[PDB]
Ligand binder design. Structure first.
Ligand SMILES: CN(C)Cc1ccc([C@H]2C[C@@H]2C(=O)Nc2nc3ccc(-c4cccnc4)cc3s2)cc1
Ligand SMILES: CN(C)Cc1ccc([C@H]2C[C@@H]2C(=O)Nc2nc3ccc(-c4cccnc4)cc3s2)cc1
Lengths: 237, 240
């Protein structure tokens, strides 16, 4: 890759001849437009510290009035939900398990950092360079019994949502509980109904989804446990 | 952090709403100034393919004539050699081992990439963000870092780079002291051929000195590979 002259020389540093300079380059970013000015600088700085290759990075904020904004890393292929739907019938099960592995890697970091996503779904996940999936944006169809009944959020409630996300991936973006009302989803899950097994998902994969969908959160596997299991299936293939 | 208006809006992508935009940020770079144009566009692309957190990245090249130049990632604390000397008596053994580990990661990647540095030394390594060490000046195209097959037959391999690494370790652990300080090239060649090795630095442990000696085995086939050295150096770091 070649540079024209967006290079600014400053001073010598080396002794061949080296220089300290600036490289003012146009980087593609995603800008989200939007009380408590001081708190939002801290809130962004806290989110900025949550760095991981499988999480969409927030570069900064703009507070110089007018429509105020958040600066994020640009994901070249948009959201996972749309990426799956527009490519339906062209996926290999390997690609789909890879997508789930990326999400789990990011989630295993969030679990370790003690951060509850609260709303993990394919619409909240984005597709980047060479189909890499990154987690972003931190709803009853992705809710666990403790969450839709009591709003009892934890990493284990994010584990349930990941079970739903996995199904969304292996079903190539199908709508979970397609024609079901908020009350009907609650009734169905309570009565013991679980999402069907997609053809692209193996018996071991569907077993993992069902483990994420266990009634009591303490019966569900943590993301660190899920990461090691999915990493093994990925490499053994 | 805060951004003012170094933001350029382009198009709507979201529906809160999201926009595709460009961000013009002032990135600190190191510019090295200088065989047809075509060949050096390819060589710059090949060197750009060699990406690792422990190697100084080449961002690109400038070919719009006048003095032609190469643009690298800037390293805020300069070269290792000078950083060791200017901070002597202020290093913990853990920091020095941490420095050797950094070089080892970068070198193990170059080893696997089938790339031979040919001139590994503290003078070529650079210090960055929170004392991180990164290898530099490998594909840019002395007896003290040279292995016996290199000073005898010029047999350069990843194994000869391991010898340079053992000497680099000595430079690190001796806080930038000159190896074979008052020894002529003829003196160095002779001494190493008889079996004499660099003495153990004060801050280097017994286990660390064994590592350094394995890097200094007469035969390259007896020296440990960077992959083996990494696992061993990482193990020492995680425990003690
Ligand atoms: C030339 N090329 C730039 C044209 C082009 C235009 C539009 C798109 C669309 C598909 C891509 C897209 O939607 N990218 C996005 N990236 C991000 C990153 C972060 C956030 C984000 C994160 C957190 C909160 N809110 C938004 C949203 C998006 S949409 C691709 C290429
Ligand atoms: C903010 N600023 C005003 C303070 C400041 C400026 C300069 C330095 C000097 C010490 C640092 C330095 O020497 N950095 C270097 N970085 C590189 C990166 C690549 C190469 C390089 C690599 C391969 C081939 N040629 C050159 C040389 C250097 S020197 C420290 C603080």
């Amino acid at each position: 890759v070649i540079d024209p002259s967006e290079l600014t020389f400053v001073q010598e540093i080396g002794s061949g001849l080296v220089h300290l300079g600036y490289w003012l380059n146009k980087d593609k970013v995603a800008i989200k437009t939007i009380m408590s000015e001081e708190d939002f600088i801290e809130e962004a700085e806290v989110m900025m510290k949550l760095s991981h290759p499988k999480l969409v990075q927030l570069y900064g904020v703009c507070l110089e009035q007018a429509p105020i904004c958040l600066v994020f890393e640009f994901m070249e292929h948009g959201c996972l939900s749309d990426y799956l739907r527009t490519q339906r019938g062209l996926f290999a099960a390997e690609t789909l398990l890879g997508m789930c592995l990326d999400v789990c890697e990011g989630m295993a970091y969030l679990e370790e950092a003690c951060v509850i996503h609260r709303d993990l779904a394919a619409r909240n996940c984005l597709v980047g360079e060479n189909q890499v999936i990154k987690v972003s944006d931190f709803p009853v169809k992705w809710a666990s019994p403790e969450v839709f009944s009591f709003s009892r959020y934890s990493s284990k409630s994010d584990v349930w949502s990941f079970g739903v996300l996995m199904w969304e991936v292996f079903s190539e973006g199908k709508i979970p509980y397609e024609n079901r009302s908020n009350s009907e989803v609650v009734e169905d899950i309570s009565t013991g109904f679980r999402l069907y097994k997609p053809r692209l998902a193996s018996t071991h994969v569907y077993q993992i989804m069902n483990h994420c969908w266990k009634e009591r959160p303490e019966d569900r596997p943590a993301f660190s446990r899920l990461l090691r299991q999915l990493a093994e299936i990925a490499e053994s293939g």
